[PDB]
Every structure is written in C-alpha cells, then in structure tokens.
C-alpha cells in the first residue's frame, strides 16, 4: 500500500 | 468559514532574518484550488535610523532604503498589516523557501514588535507550507509530466524563473514571484495530484509524528536541500532517537552514508566531526536532525521505488545494508543522543519562550498608544522585554523618548555607526561600483546607497  | 492559501514573499535589506530589516512584503489570497480570491497586498517597511542595508541585497531587490522610507510605514505598522493577513482563520500561509527564510523574518518582525512570534502559524487551523520542498519532492519522487530544468553545472534548478520557463509559464513587479509560486502549485497539483495532496496532508506535525517509529527504526524517504541536488535532494533515513532537548527534533541517520564512524568512534569525536564538516578526508557523520515542525518531506520508505532510486543514483542495496547493521546495534542510539545531549536583543528570539504572564503583558504593550508607553506601570519577568521595548519605542516612535532616552538612542547609533564601520561601508560601495561598472542600474543603486549613508549617519 502506497499514498502516491 | 472557508480554507484559504495566502501566498507571500519578502524582499529584505540583507540575508539575516534577525539583524537585517524587511523592505517589502507581497501577498495574495487564494481558494483551495489556487484561484485568486483577493487583491494584491504590497507594501513597504520604513527602516529605522540605526540600520544600513547590505549592499548586495539592494542590488538584488532593486529597492533603495530611500524608496522604502518614503513609501513605507514604520515596522510596528508593517508588522500590524502582516499580522492581520496572517491571522485570518483557516489560512495556510506559504511561499517559496519561506520555511528557512520568510518565516524567520516574520517571527523576528513579530518578536521585535510585540506579537506572538508563533501563534499566527497554528491558531484557528492556520498552518504553513513551503512550495520549494514540494518542487524538490516532485522532482525526486514523481517527476514525469513536468519539465525539470538544469543549470550550467548539470544539476536540477529549483529557481522559480527556470521552473516557470521550462514549463511554458509567463514569468514577468512585487507580485511576480508570488504569481510564479501559485503557477507552480497549480502545476504540481494538476500533473501530480496524489503527491501534492499527500505532502499537503503531512505539513501537520502529528501526521509526521505518526510516520516515526524509533524503537523499530522504520526507514523513510526524506527530501531535503541538505542532501544536495546531486542526489535530487533525497535519501533513505532511519530514526534512531529523539533529540534530548528539542521536543520537535528527531535524530535521523542517512542510510546512503558511511555508518562505520557510528559504530567505531565515541561521542565527543562525532560531535565536532559532525560540526567541522568537509575539512577531514574521516568519512562524514551520516546524521541529521529532522524537525517535525518545519514541514519536512517524509514518506514511508517504499514510495521511493527501485526505479526511482536508479533515476537519482541512489544505491538501494547499500542503504538496506546499513539499516540491517544499525538495527542489530542499539548502542549507536545512546551514542547519537549524546552528540546533542550574543549581547544584541534583536538576535535573541531563541533564548526561550515567554511565559503566559510575560506574553499577556506584551499584549498590553500592543494595546497601548505609543504616547502612553512612558506612563506604563506593568512589570516584566523575562529580561529581553525591557530591551525590546526601548528599541521598539526609539525605532518607531522617536518623538516619545524623554531626554535620557534620546541620549541612550544616540549612544546606540554611535555604537553601530563606528568610524571602522562607516569607512568599510563607504569602501564596499566604491569597490562594487568598480566591479559592476558595466551594470549601469547597479552603479546607480550603489550610488543611491551612498547618498543614504551620507544623510542617516554623519
Ligand atoms: Mg523569496
Ligand atoms: Mg517512478
């Protein structure tokens, strides 16, 4: 999972 | 009540946010999408008569002390106008390199003129941001879709004029820098919205705090100008310990560095090895403070992808190596903690915070008309305040000084304006004339600065  | 960004910029008379004085302030307010929702705010600050500007700054800004004195208001009024703008609720106050510069100027202006040097930046859902670290992060992490200009040396340039030009944006006027900053915010928001929204979310210190797991040494991406353009200002860091004094500073290790000196050497050694840098070649001490209150760019380590590390010449494998050695070595932790374990009041902002009573009393100072400052009965605890108060009255309201105060102001002016100082300053200008003989507008500015030292001093 990554924000950007 | 609606959220607004207030873009702003100072021109000053020198590099020192405390010892040098403001010349011009410029600002425009914006909605959450960067549509202009107000009028340009532009105005000057009259410099007090105990000060001569740094020649180099006038050459940059094009603003003589004569022009700022004639068109401006005393620093008390200057502070007032800025204060209003800044304290409108739900404002995000931002600029370009503002964190390391413009905010320091703002705090000193407030400190000198009896406003809280900090509250403006967090009260009523105010916050601050700095679009330079955004441009840097964007280049480092997610560059595609924007043109990234290189200077003559081959490294990336984050100067506003190059950036706008590289991206077909008109960059023309006090307002020009401010408009450029807006245009860059728009650009990054359009081309790269998820990063922009993430960084925006993480200007807040408690969201930053959540990223930091010291016991586990969770590695993070960090984008800082201290890392240098030659690696796109980026590395992987790991938190080792909290600063033992500064509640807002965490001690990071630079994982791309050389961690051998951490293990091998003792604390005293490392303290000045870290201090006296680039004289010993004796690998550098790979250790930097991150201040959660200074809008640092931080993100979970894997947002910097393998391919991203290749792009920037960062050695992914070496970094993972240094992390593994660190984790299995928690005596470095107590070692790094151990590393961290002026008579002019203008320069004393950071000698402590003012207590509640101190700060309530400066509040009365503010409320009092200049004329009734002599007749004021209140007491002060912190020893700086008397000093700030005399300087504040002499600089802004010389008419209100009594006999012994006028004398004291004179001795203070003689103290700065020494024969040594004046001859230097005269000689400085005269050499700059020669240096810039080809540059006619500068010759003229330089000459104007001479006219000003003539009148204000002898
Ligand atoms: Mg600026
Ligand atoms: Mg990529």
Q: How close does chain B come to A4, measured CA to CA in Å?
A: 5
Nearest listed ligand to the Cα of residue B305: 2
Q: Are B234 and B140 in contact (CB under 8 A)?
A: yes
Interface residues on A facing B, Cβ-Cβ cutoff 8 A: 2-4
Q: What are phi and psi of B46, to 5 degrees?
A: -70, 125
The pair of structure tokens assigned to B108 is: 């000193």
Task: Kindly report the number of other CB atoms within 10 A of residue B31's CB atom.
Answer: 13
Alpha carbon distance B130, B142 (integer Å): 18
Q: Which residues of A touch B300 (CB under 8 A)?
A: 2-3
Q: What are phi and psi of B245, to 5 degrees?
A: -120, -55
In angstroms, the CA B113 to CA B101 distance is 19
Q: Which strands make up the sheet holding B249-254, listed edge to edge? A: B287-291, B249-254, B234-242, B220-223, B297-300
The answer to whether the Cβ–Cβ distance between B300 and A3 falls below 8 Å is yes
Residue B126 CA to residue B88 CA, distance in Å, equals: 8
Q: Is B167 on the interface with A (CB under 8 A)?
A: no
Dist. CA B94–CA B295, nearest whole Å:
11
Mark the residues whose beta carbon lies below 5 A from ion ligand 2.
B 308
End-to-end CA distance of chain B: 54
Size of interface A-B (CB pairs under 8 A): 17
Place of tokens 């961290």: B340
Chain A residues whose beta carbon lies within 8 Å of the beta carbon of residue B142: 4
Chain B residues near residue A4 by CB distance under 8 angstroms: 141-142, 192, 194-195, 197-198, 299, 303
User: Helices B131-141 and B193-201 sit at what angle, rounded to 10 degrees?
Assistant: 130
* CB neighbours of residue B99 within 10 Å: 22
Quote the DSSP letter at residue A3.
Answer: -
- Please give, one letter per residue, the 3-state secondary structure of chain B: CCCEEEEEEEEECCCCCCCCCEEEEEEEEECCCCCECCCCEEEEECCCCCCCCCHHHHHHHCCCHHHHHHHCECHHHHHHHHHHHHHCCCEEEEECCCCCCHHHHHHHHHHHHCCCCCHHHCHHHCEEEEHHHHHHHHHHHCCCCCCCCECCCCCECCCHHHHHHHCCCCCCCCCHHHHHHHHHHHHHHHHCHHHHHHHHHCCCHHHHHHHCCCCCCCCEEEECHHHCHHHCCEEEEEEEEECCCCCCEEEEEECCCCCHHHHHCCHHHHHHHHHCCCCCCCCCCCEEEEECCCCCEEEEHHHCCHHHHHHHCCCHHHHHHHHHHHHCCCHHHHHHHHHHCCCCHHHCCCCCCCCHHHHHHHHHHHHCCHHHCCCCCCCCCCCHHHHHHHHHHHHHCHHHCCHHHHHHHHHHHHHHCCHHHHHHHHHHHHHHHHHCCCCHHHHHHHHHHHHHHHHHHC
The token pair that represents B356 in the structure block: 């509640």
B390 CA to centre of ligand 1 in angstroms: 30
> B1, B26 in Cβ contact below 8 A?
no
From the CA atom positions of chain A, what is the Rg in Å? 4
Burial of B353 (0-12, 13-18, 19+ CB in 10 A): exposed
CB burial of residue B386 (10 Å; 0-12, 13-18, 19+)? exposed
- Test A4 with B198 for CB contact under 8 angstroms: yes
Separation of first and last alpha carbons in chain A: 9
Ligand nearest to the CA of B60: 1
- For this experimental structure, what is the resolution in angstroms? 2.7
Chain A touched by B260 (CB under 8 Å): no
CB contact under 8 Å between A4 and B141, yes or no, is yes
How far is CA B199 from each of CA B85, B222, B324, B337, rounded to the nearest angstrom? 24, 12, 28, 29
Q: What six digits make up the tokens of B239?
A: 């938190």
Closest Cα in chain A to B192: A4
Give the integer Cα–Cα distance in Å for B172 and B181.
12
Contacts of B25 (CB under 8 A, 6+ apart): B8, B9, B10, B41, B42, B43, B45, B78, B81, B82
In A, which residues are within 8 Å of B192 by CB distance? 4
CA distance B217 to chain A (A): 19
Put simply, the answer to whether A3 touches B302 (Cβ < 8 Å) is no
Measured in angstroms, the CA of B300 and the nearest CA of chain A are apart by 8
Token pair 């900090």 is found at: B118
| Residue B310: both structure tokens together | 């290749």
DSSP state of A1: -
What's the CA-to-centroid distance between B153 and ligand 2, angstroms? 24
Task: Decide: B220 and B209 in contact? Cβ < 8 Å.
Answer: no
* Residue B156 burial class via C-beta count within 10 angstroms: exposed 0-12, middle 13-18, buried 19 and up: buried
- The number of angstroms, rounded, from the C-alpha of B81 to the middle of its chain's C-alpha atoms is 20
Distance B398 CA to ligand 1 centre (A): 31
C-alpha distances out from residue B305 to B109, B141, B218, B383, B419, Å: 43, 8, 16, 52, 60
Q: Are B160 and B180 in contact, with CB atoms under 8 Å apart?
A: yes
B297 touches chain A (CB under 8 A): no
Report whether B80 contacts B359 (CB < 8 A): no
Ligand nearest to the CA of B144: 2
A3–B198 CB contact, under 8 Å? yes
Contact B63, B71 (CB under 8 A): no
* Way the structure was solved: X-ray
Beta strands B127-130 and B220-223 are: unpaired
The answer to whether B144 and B124 have CB atoms below 8 angstroms apart is: no
Spell out the domains of chain B, with CATH numbers in brackets: 1-192 (3.30.420.10), 205-341 (3.30.1520.20), 342-402 (1.20.1280.70), 403-458 (1.10.287.1240)
Q: Is B421 on the interface with A (CB under 8 A)?
A: no
CA–CA separation, B231 and B47 (whole Å):
41
Residue B22 half-sphere exposure, CB side, CA atoms within 13 Å? Answer: 30
């Amino acid at each position: 999972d990554i924000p950007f | 009540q609606q959220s607004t960004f207030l873009f702003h910029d100072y021109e000053t008379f020198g590099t020192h946010p405390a010892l040098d004085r403001p010349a011009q302030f410029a600002a425009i307010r914006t909605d959450s999408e960067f549509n202009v929702i107000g009028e340009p705010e532009v105005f000057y600050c009259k410099p007090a008569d105990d000060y001569l500007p740094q020649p180099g700054a006038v050459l940059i800004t094009g603003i003589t002390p004569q022009e700022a004195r004639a068109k401006g208001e005393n620093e008390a009024a200057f502070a007032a106008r800025i204060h209003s703008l800044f304290t409108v609720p739900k404002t995000c106050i931002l600029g370009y390199n503002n964190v390391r510069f413009d905010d320091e100027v703002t705090r000193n202006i407030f400190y000198r003129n009896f406003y809280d040097p900090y509250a403006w930046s967090w009260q009523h859902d105010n916050s601050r941001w700095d679009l330079l670290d955004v441009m840097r992060a964007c280049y480092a992490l997610r560059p595609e879709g924007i043109n990234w200009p290189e200077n003559d040396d081959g490294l990336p340039s984050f100067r506003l004029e190059h950036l706008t030009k590289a991206n077909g944006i008109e960059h023309s006027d006090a307002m020009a820098d401010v408009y450029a900053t807006i245009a860059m915010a728009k650009l990054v928001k359009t081309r790269q919205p998820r990063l922009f929204d993430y960084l925006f979310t993480h200007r807040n210190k408690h969201k930053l705090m959540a990223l930091i797991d010291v016991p586990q040494m969770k590695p993070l991406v960090h984008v800082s100008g201290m890392f240098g353009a030659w690696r796109g200002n980026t590395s992987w860091v790991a938190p080792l310990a909290w600063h033992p004094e500064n509640r807002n500073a965490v001690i990071m290790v630079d994982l791309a560095g050389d961690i051998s000196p951490l293990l091998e050497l003792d604390s005293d050694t490392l303290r000045e090895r870290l201090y006296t840098a680039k004289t010993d070649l004796n690998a550098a001490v790979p250790v930097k403070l991150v201040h959660i209150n200074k809008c640092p760019v931080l993100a979970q380590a894997n947002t910097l992808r393998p391919e991203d590390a290749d792009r920037l010449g960062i050695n992914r494998q070496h970094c993972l190596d240094n992390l593994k050695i660190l984790r299995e070595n928690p005596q470095v932790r107590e070692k790094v903690v151990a590393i961290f374990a002026s008579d002019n009041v203008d320069a004393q902002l950071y000698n402590g915070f003012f207590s509640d009573a101190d700060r309530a009393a400066m509040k009365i100072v503010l409320e009092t008309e200049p004329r009734n400052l002599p007749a004021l009965d209140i007491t002060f605890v912190d020893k700086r305040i008397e000093k700030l108060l005399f300087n504040y009255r002499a600089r802004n309201f010389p008419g209100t000084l009594d006999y012994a105060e006028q004398q004291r102001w004179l001795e203070h002016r003689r103290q700065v304006f020494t024969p040594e100082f004046l001859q230097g300053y005269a000689d400085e200008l005269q050499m700059l004339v020669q240096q810039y003989a080809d540059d006619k507008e500068k010759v003229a500015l330089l000459k104007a600065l001479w006219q000003y030292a003539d009148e204000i001093v002898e």
